[PDB]
Design a protein around this ligand. Structure first.
Ligand SMILES: [Mg+2]
Ligand SMILES: [Mg+2]
Ligand SMILES: [Mg+2]
Ligand SMILES: [Mg+2]
Ligand SMILES: [Mg+2]
Ligand SMILES: [Mg+2]
Ligand SMILES: [Mg+2]
Ligand SMILES: [Mg+2]
Ligand SMILES: [Mg+2]
Ligand SMILES: [Mg+2]
Ligand SMILES: [Mg+2]
Ligand SMILES: [Mg+2]
Ligand SMILES: [Mg+2]
Ligand SMILES: [Mg+2]
Ligand SMILES: [Mg+2]
Ligand SMILES: [Mg+2]
Ligand SMILES: [Mg+2]
Ligand SMILES: [Mg+2]
Ligand SMILES: [Mg+2]
Ligand SMILES: [Zn+2]
Lengths: 135, 71, 213, 74, 39, 81, 103
RNA sequence: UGACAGACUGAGAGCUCUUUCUUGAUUCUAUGGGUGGUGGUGCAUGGCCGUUCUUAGUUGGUGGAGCGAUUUGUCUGGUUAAUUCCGUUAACGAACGAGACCUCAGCCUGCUAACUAGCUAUGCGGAGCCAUCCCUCCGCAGCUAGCUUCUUAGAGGGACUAUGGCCGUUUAGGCCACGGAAGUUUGAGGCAAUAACAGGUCUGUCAUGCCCUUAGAUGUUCUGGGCCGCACGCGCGCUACACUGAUGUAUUCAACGAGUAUAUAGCCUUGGCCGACAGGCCCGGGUAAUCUUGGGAAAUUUCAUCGUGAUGGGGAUAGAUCAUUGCAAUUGUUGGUCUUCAACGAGGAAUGCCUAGUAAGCGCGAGUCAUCAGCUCGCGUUGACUACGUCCCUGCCCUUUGUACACACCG
């Protein structure tokens, strides 16, 4: 299944799935937002939203009940403060919330009582289907 | 540097004198014997005193020796 | 509701504050310790001193006052906090009482060396392994000097210092300056527990004599 | 679990090695576990024995176990 | 607006765990409170 | 010190019932517990009774412990009792 | 008639705590009660590092102070009166006894 | 004694004045005397700390030598990290320091246990699939455990140089080696002698002598300013000078700690929604192995973009603007957004720290704290080069020796 495929080629395969599998909405700020306070430029690849989606539905598929203030820590990283020492900074909550809301508006994941987000039965199904098709 | 100090050396000789018969040439049994005859405040002190008594018996079983007076 | 960390820290702070109080009142009384034992519904606070009559006073008016004010300051439930007055088993093996004695002799005007050897001899006659008395300050002169009086066994490094040494520091407000008294007392091995520590010195050996049959 | 990436890899190494030794100990044979023990312990003695090396604590007067703050005289 | 409970001083105050003592009074009373020097 | 007769009256009645008293050093606390007064007067009339040895004082390291004395109980009885 | 009684003990000294902790367990072993304990919880070390000098001169040297706090739990099934019969023996100084009723 | 309206005032200080209500022996006036003082003096002191001093050193009793100061003991030699030990011996017998000791880390499928730690099996739930079962990956619940390996913390055990070889009075010891978790005292700390310093601290202490002041105050409190000012010299540092890299994806592995009734949701904050960020609103947990937090850290790994260019290295200086904390942010508290793109091309003479999970690299926690960490104290992560010596330089210990030094060669 998903743990038998390398997580790089799998995310490439899934992020190609959501592309040619129907569609989802895409905000009217996707081309301008940096995805993190500490980032320097927006994501280099124009097809990053889908990557960020395919990489992100694998998080809920291997875990259970992850909020947004946990995804911000997931995709946060090192922030360099110029002449002061660098520290750890969290990414932006707007993209994190929006991709989950879209996965809801496709039925891959759903919000969870007791808080958090959980993979759906059908969302589990297509992830293992696509996993079956990765070299 | 593993020089044994005065307490260990003195106690080793002075326990050799009192019980020559109940000691032997094995370290471990000598450990137990020394635990059955004297009151020491650390396991490391016991292991050190028993280690100095065991080769003292090896050289006693070899030949003569200084101040300890075996009957 | 209070956590465990803050509970234990407050307990220790209470004991520190209480003792640093009770060393002001029971000064010319031989004060020698306080112990806070907590029972259900009650907290016993055994004061111990060398002259229990003095802390008790006349028909216990002083102990009544102490109980009442300890209750009121530290917001104990009323009638929940009580004080007692035990007496130190050996006055001559406690450096708090001995330092206070020396303090009072000094402030009386007694010559320094006479008082210090008096303290020394009393501690040695009460069965202590050794004693050390340090007196420091302006003794007879404008330059400060210190005199050390020693006797018997005395150890200063390692772990047993904590359990085999009883030490006390006390100021003297003699005219024209301040004197410092340091009293160190080496206690002796007492498996009973009444007079000294139970565990022997880390370098001490006991070969049972070779019984014969 | 625990440690870092290299430390986890070495822990897993030791896990396969000691697990195989214990399996041949308890279920296969005492002689053919000696075999595999000798092949494992001729290559590297720390597929079976772990490193007692730990991170030495830090002491004041410098930022590190052994390093000290740079000293200036004038 | 935050002083040592033992001396009412304003510098080197230890507010951790709720002590509220200055760094010198805490040293003088550390053993009585129960803080042991192990290492 | 300028204190109303009512305020000192309550300081003496509370000094009566138990005989013991404490303040803190916090100056201008503005409401002593156990009795109604800004905690300045309490200190400042114990500062009088100490001078007349009606009360024996322990500075308690700047925190003010007061115990009524056999000499001052006889004075204070003729005052509110 | 049988509840779920949890008795929690805290101390600064290991041995004085473990004496009482064993005493309770054995006092509840004579009554053929279900004693699920003692459960040991991670020692909490309260640490304060302070400069030795009062005046800031010389080598900067520190002393690290520590309070170890130990947390034991004993589990019982009984009525609160039988346990109060048991947790009424002589308790060493410094030990906290804080019996409650779990859900 | 308290107070209205204007002046007085920064002031809504009845401070002071115009006006006369209010209040009653608490006050006022002088003498005396106390009191306060982060006032002076650390060269009057106490306590504490640092250093001499990281080394092995120090001292009585009795006896010996000397007129005496003094000396021996406390030593020729071997040995030790050690005034450690063997031994020698006008000394014998002892006291401290070293060691022992205590803390942490290292081993234990052995003991005690554990629903506030989990692993295992079985059941039900999902998803894949030669599909019906089996197989794999997760979820969930218990009277599953002949469960405690992993986690926690208690009791103990374990190493003693024990065994072997060689060197050595073939003593004390030393080197080598199998074994072993471990064979530098296993590693790292805590503790730590005599004698001393005119070392630092009166600005920690209602610790303190003396002096000074004590009302027109050096007391206390309020308001505002400074402590941060800037031609310049110095010390600890942070960021770098790039490709063994920067940027942008994907990927994802720790430990030590922390969480005051914190007001009526409040300290740490999960979860949901709004927002590009900053930040906000709502429903909540936790006084805690229970909730934050299996602490989903960074360096690192991965695939792209850059291409030897003061470049996309570097991020100083500065403009505009938003938000947060706080009673108040101005000489910007701090955090965001866009813009501005300085020196710096691996650094002269000099100089510091370092011998293994160490140096160095990387981030995290706590202290300070309403807000502010380039600091300090800890913690894990990645993990080497070199040496296994010497007394050349800087010093230290012991002996012999010279001395016109004794405040002692800074003589
Ligand atoms: Mg860096
Ligand atoms: Mg002032
Ligand atoms: Mg001085
Ligand atoms: Mg001094
Ligand atoms: Mg002599
Ligand atoms: Mg003589
Ligand atoms: Mg003579
Ligand atoms: Mg050591
Ligand atoms: Mg001082
Ligand atoms: Mg001001
Ligand atoms: Mg420095
Ligand atoms: Mg850049
Ligand atoms: Mg990168
Ligand atoms: Mg500031
Ligand atoms: Mg901080
Ligand atoms: Mg600082
Ligand atoms: Mg000459
Ligand atoms: Mg001369
Ligand atoms: Mg010269
Ligand atoms: Zn203080």
């Amino acid at each position: 299944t998903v743990k038998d495929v390398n997580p790089h080629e799998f995310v490439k395969a899934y992020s190609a799935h959501l592309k040619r599998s129907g569609k989802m909405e895409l905000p009217e700020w996707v081309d301008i937002v940096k995805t993190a306070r500490f980032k320097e430029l927006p994501p280099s690849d124009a097809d990053w939203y889908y990557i960020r989606a395919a990489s992100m539905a694998r998080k809920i598929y291997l875990r259970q009940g992850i909020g947004i203030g946990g995804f911000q820590k997931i995709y946060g990283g090192r922030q360099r403060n110029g002449s002061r020492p660098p520290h750890f900074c969290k990414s932006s909550g707007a993209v994190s919330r929006n991709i989950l809301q879209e996965l809801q508006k496709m039925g891959i994941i759903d919000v969870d009582p007791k808080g958090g987000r959980l993979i759906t039965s059908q969302g589990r199904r297509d992830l293992d289907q696509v996993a079956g098709t990765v070299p | 540097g593993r020089v044994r100090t005065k307490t260990v050396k003195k106690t080793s000789r002075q326990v050799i004198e009192k019980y020559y018969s109940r000691m032997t040439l094995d370290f471990h049994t000598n450990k137990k014997v020394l635990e059955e005859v004297s009151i020491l405040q650390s396991k490391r002190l016991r292991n050190k005193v028993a280690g100095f008594t065991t080769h003292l018996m090896r050289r006693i079983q070899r030949g003569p020796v200084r101040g300890i007076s075996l009957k | 509701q209070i956590s465990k960390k803050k509970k234990f820290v407050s307990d220790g702070v209470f004991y520190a504050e209480l003792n640093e109080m009770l060393t002001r009142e029971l000064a010319e009384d031989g004060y020698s310790g306080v112990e806070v034992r907590v029972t259900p519904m009650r907290t016993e606070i055994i004061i111990r001193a060398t002259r229990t009559q003095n802390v008790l006073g006349e028909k216990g008016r002083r102990i009544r006052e102490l109980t009442s004010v300890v209750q009121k300051r530290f917001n104990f439930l009323e009638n929940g906090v009580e004080l007692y007055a035990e007496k130190v088993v050996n006055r001559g093996l406690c450096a708090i009482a001995q330092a206070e004695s020396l303090r009072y002799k000094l402030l009386g005007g007694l010559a320094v060396r006479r008082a210090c050897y008096g303290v020394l001899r009393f501690v040695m006659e009460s069965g202590a392994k050794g004693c050390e008395v340090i007196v420091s300050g302006k003794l007879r002169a404008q330059r400060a000097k210190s005199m050390k009086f020693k006797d018997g066994y005395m150890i200063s490094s390692g772990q047993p210092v904590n359990e085999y040494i009883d030490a006390a520091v006390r100021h003297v407000l003699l005219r024209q300056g301040v004197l410092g008294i340091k009293v160190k007392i080496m206690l002796d091995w007492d498996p009973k527990g009444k007079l000294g520590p139970t565990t022997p010195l880390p370098d001490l050996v006991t070969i049972h004599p070779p019984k014969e049959e | 679990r625990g440690g870092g990436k290299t430390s986890q890899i070495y822990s897993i190494r030791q896990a396969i090695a000691k697990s195989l030794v214990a399996y041949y100990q308890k279920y296969v044979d005492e002689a053919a576990k000696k075999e595999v023990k000798e092949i494992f312990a001729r290559y590297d003695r720390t597929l079976l024995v772990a490193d007692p090396r730990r991170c030495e604590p830090k002491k004041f007067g410098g930022r590190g176990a052994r390093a000290r703050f740079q000293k200036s005289y004038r | 607006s935050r002083v040592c409970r033992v001396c009412g001083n304003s510098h080197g105050l230890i507010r951790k765990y709720g002590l509220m003592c200055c760094r010198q009074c805490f040293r003088s009373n550390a053993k009585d409170i129960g803080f042991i020097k192990y290492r | 010190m300028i204190i109303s007769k009512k305020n000192r009256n309550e300081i003496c009645k509370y000094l009566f019932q138990e005989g013991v008293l404490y303040a803190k050093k916090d100056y201008n606390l503005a409401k002593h517990p156990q009795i109604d007064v800004p905690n300045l007067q309490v200190i400042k009339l114990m500062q009088s009774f100490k001078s007349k040895e009606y009360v024996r004082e322990t500075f308690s390291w700047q925190h003010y412990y007061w115990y009524l004395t056999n000499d001052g109980i006889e004075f204070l009885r003729n005052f509110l009792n | 008639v049988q509840h779920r009684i949890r008795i929690t003990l805290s101390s600064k000294s290991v041995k004085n705590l473990e004496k009482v902790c064993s005493d309770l367990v054995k006092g509840a072993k004579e009554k053929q009660l279900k004693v699920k304990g003692p459960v040991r919880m991670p020692t909490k070390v309260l640490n304060i590092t302070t400069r030795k000098s009062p005046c800031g001169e010389g080598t900067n040297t520190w002393d690290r102070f520590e309070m170890r706090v130990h947390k034991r739990v004993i589990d019982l099934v009984s009525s609160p009166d039988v346990v109060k019969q048991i947790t009424s023996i002589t308790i060493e100084p410094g030990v906290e006894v804080e019996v409650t009723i779990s859900d």
